[PDB]
Amino acid sequence: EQYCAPDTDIRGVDAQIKNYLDQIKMARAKFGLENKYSLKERLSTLTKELNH
């Protein structure tokens, strides 16, 4: 909405995308690693030891 609202420079809001476009994989590699194996193998052995 800040591209069309008046009294703004175009290049100052084009740099708010490069901030936003790198904050979207700094939250997709923070839940794509702690959900990868550190919470997979906590559910691997614990579902075997529940069955036994």
């Binding site: 591209y3 069309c4 175009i10 084009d14 995308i17 476009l21 994989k25 997709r28 590699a29």
Partner: protein, 49 residues
């Protein structure tokens, strides 16, 4: 009334220069949306670094 046509000319130079400004703004919104659609395509390929 057509003799002068002098102080009626720069008020059309004003509204024509704002319209060429509003064109270049919304031509820039359709060039940063096409940056978001180049990242989401490449990221959902599977290759991140």
């Amino acid at each position: 009334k057509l003799e002068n046509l002098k102080d009626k000319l720069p008020d059309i130079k004003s509204i024509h220069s704002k319209l060429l400004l509003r064109i270049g703004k919304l031509q820039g919104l359709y060039d940063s949306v096409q940056v978001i659609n180049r990242e989401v395509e490449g990221l959902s390929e599977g290759r991140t670094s």
